[model samples]
Target: GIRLKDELINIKQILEAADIMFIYEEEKWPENISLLNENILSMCLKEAVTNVVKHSQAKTCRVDIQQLWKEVVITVSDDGTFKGEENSFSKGHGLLGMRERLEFANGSLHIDTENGTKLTMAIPN
Candidate 1:
């Protein structure tokens, strides 16, 4: 709810401080999410954005949060070149840790590097 939005605003501030443009889109949050899940989602988002800032030569970063049929999906993408190979990035502790966190919440993580890099994390709503 409001908490998630507030957290996202803080994230936007981080992006601005890095001189990277930020775009955020939301289709409303799931109703009555547990605090634990809220914390998990927030932390994962922060981690995802951190990776973009630390690992990519991105000019702009976009984050989209959507409410699906039975899930809340969060996507963080950037228009930047990754310094490492796909496998290497996947094996890194940051991504691995994100996957583990999502798994513990019965969620999933997907990554696409076709154009730049896109990370999608979804949790059951």
Candidate 2:
């Protein structure tokens, strides 16, 4: 399994190619995260980034990871509006699948569209 930090770097490259500025921040990282958890986190992160690149016409996107006592929190936020019902992640199959995966791992996904769009994923550590 890959380290989340490294996988984020790879994602940053993709964002660069799309001409989207990516900002990443992390609290103290935990050690010995399970491989299964790592893979799930990686895949879900990629899926989130995919949505950002394809749907959010945002010039800048931000991702923040917080290491809590019992879980890890990943937040993806964009400044661009994800307009139209069809373009909404709530109605998209990708987001549905992402939620399913998180649930299987006893994790959770949350979306906020108040300003732009903020998607948060929390995985038990």
Candidate 3:
């Protein structure tokens, strides 16, 4: 499961392309980090961020990955106007795609619509 040492290089690539000053942290962890874990986290992180820019108008975003004891928690937040959609959770989209990916890794998804859109996905570390 050891993905590699360059686990966060994808985030760096995203930051380089993103216009907004994105922030990400993966310092703390609930359990061992590996290639599989890293791949899952990286994919979900990018998908969340991509959803932000795709669904709404956002110039800035923040991604945080924190240790939740035996689980690893990650959240993607954006500064965009809320366009309330009744289909809170739909399928065949980023949300669905991300959720499935996490599910395969024994994870879950939660949404926080405080500022704009916050997509939080977690997995047992």
Candidate 4:
């Protein structure tokens, strides 16, 4: 868990091109949380944030992580406009790769949009 926390925070350096925030729910989580899933989680985390930096036109992004019940969740939200409706996301690389990588660990991805984008993942601890 310590390693996982560290990598998540260190990735903030990659967001140097824009405004980014990190939030970790250190007081909350399932008793089963472990560091075994760190690699995959980290990969998805980078991809999600990079996607925002590349395409969102976002001025700010917030990366949030929390332990909820039997799993841990990660979210990256940006204040950039999302034109997913005008693009063929099905053929997109970043998002789909994020899904495939996380799927190997039985994790899942979700996306929300308005004038921006929010990508979240639920990983069983």
lDDT accuracy of residue 58 in candidate 4: 76
Full-model lDDT, candidate 4: 0.72
Which runs of model 1 end up more than 4 angstroms from their true locations? 89-92
Candidate 3 C-alpha lDDT tens digits along 26-63: 57744576557777877777677667656657677777
TM-score, every prediction:
0.89, 0.88, 0.77, 0.77
The list of candidate 3 runs beyond 4 A from truth reads: 1-8, 12-16, 29-31
lDDT of each: 0.83, 0.83, 0.71, 0.72
lDDT per residue (tens digit) for residues 20-95 in model 4: 5443445553355656676567767777877877778877777777777767888889888886665435655877
lDDT of 1 by residue, 5-112 (tens): 777998899899998999975567677677777778888898889989898889999998877787788999999976666475455577888888898899999888
In terms of lDDT, the best-performing candidate is: 1
* C-alpha lDDT of residue 28 in model 1: 74
Tens digits of per-residue lDDT for model 2, 8-74 = 9888998999999999766667566688887888888888888889888889999987777787778
- Tell me how far the alpha carbon of residue 50 in candidate 1 is from the true structure, in angstroms, after superposition: 0.5
